[PDB]
């Protein structure tokens, strides 16, 4: 006999309900991938036997967002088309696990200074029953995870 407010505190969070917000816009995405912290390890070892292991230089964060093609809207493409030589508008991406008809966040990830590389066009295919989907890849720094 678990109460419905006990499940909100004790139970794990399902992945499939999430909100992605790219800058000031919020746009519906099919899937989000990557988005993990990582560290190189530095190892010193000298002759008397002691072995030092340290966290080292952080690694660059690479995120992949996947989204279907909608008939009026290309604002994933216009972001990657605006790249002149090294100047692009970087913007913050927030992923947020929500409840059904999300008025309440459960977890929140924050990405800083994300800019697009490698927008992937759909694979046109005459014998396929799929939607035209696009992956955009983002390079960024500082994934942080926020409670609620």
């Amino acid at each position: 006999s678990t109460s419905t407010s006990q499940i909100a505190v004790e139970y794990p969070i399902p992945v499939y309900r999430f909100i992605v917000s790219v800058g000031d816009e919020k746009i519906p995405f099919n899937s989000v991938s990557g988005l993990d912290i990582s560290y190189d390890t530095i190892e010193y070892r000298d002759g008397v036997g002691n072995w030092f292991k340290m966290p080292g230089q952080s690694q660059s964060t690479n995120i992949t967002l996947r989204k279907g093609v909608f008939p009026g809207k290309t604002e994933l493409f216009d972001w990657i088309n605006s790249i002149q030589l090294n100047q692009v508008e970087k913007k913050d991406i927030t992923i947020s696990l929500t409840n059904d008809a999300g008025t309440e966040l459960l977890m929140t990830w924050n990405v800083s200074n994300a800019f697009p590389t490698s927008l992937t066009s759909p694979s046109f295919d005459a014998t396929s029953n799929d939607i035209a989907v696009q992956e955009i890849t983002l390079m960024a720094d500082r994934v942080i995870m926020q409670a609620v």
Partner: protein
Amino acid sequence: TTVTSYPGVYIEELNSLALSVSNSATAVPVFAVDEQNQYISEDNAIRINSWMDYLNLIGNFNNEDKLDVSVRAYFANGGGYCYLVKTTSLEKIIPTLDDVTLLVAAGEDIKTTVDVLCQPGKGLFAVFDGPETELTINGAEEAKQAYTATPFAAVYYPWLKADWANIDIPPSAVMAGVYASVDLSRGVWKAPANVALKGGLEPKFLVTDELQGEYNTGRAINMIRNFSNTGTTVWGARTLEDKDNWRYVPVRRLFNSVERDIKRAMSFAMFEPNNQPTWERVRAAISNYLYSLWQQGGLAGSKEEDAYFVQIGKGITMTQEQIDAGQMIVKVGLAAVRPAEFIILQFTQDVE
């Protein structure tokens, strides 16, 4: 000026001075202009993008004008674009202009307007002049009585003089350019003191160290004095507030600059639905900005959680009553760096 009929080249000979342009994101001054100035009109600000832009508005550079020698000293030190508002309509135009940060009196009485527009909410900092007369260590606490005790103001004493200028230059106009030159090379958090003046400036009155000790304490008057190895240089960072919170102009100008940048990030949250997915986007937008400012060394803290904190919430900051009214309350704290002002040397005769 020059009339061009054939393609050719033209080898006109004329003496006109040209100053290089600078772009400053953090310091946009407004020069108070006296009445009996025939070039600018009442009740509109004239944006002057460069010294050449100013030299098109007036025909000749005039040595006798207080406005002319103050604007040339401003652009020689590295100032960006500025506005020119007349002093009697000055209280109407500064609220219209959005990105104005500095308020500069170029030898003008703005003490009436500074009390009514410099508030804790608004981002205006107001540098103005010291007294033109050569003052004393003796009647020193009466000269500090003439100025208000607001934390948003700094007073620089000696009216500078130059070989090109016939009259003495007000020192606040050269300090609008020093503020823009400091913040571009080292940041807003760095104090504008011990910076040399790039124009051909030197103080009208040489200032003893014992006199500067009188004025630095209560309603502090920063002073521009000459050093033989540095030339002329600025030698103060203190505001007119003696309280330990807002004693220094790098701490007051950092908080003015941070809250203006947070103003722009809260501009996108305007007229969005007032629920939790907005508040976690408002907090994330501020937390990115204060982190990258801490990474530049702007905020003082060894641990990142010591430099700042942001708090939004329905239990924390705003009532259910205040949410229905439409309000959204955020709490931000910062930890600025203070400048080292005194250095005490102890010389010992025996080495041990």
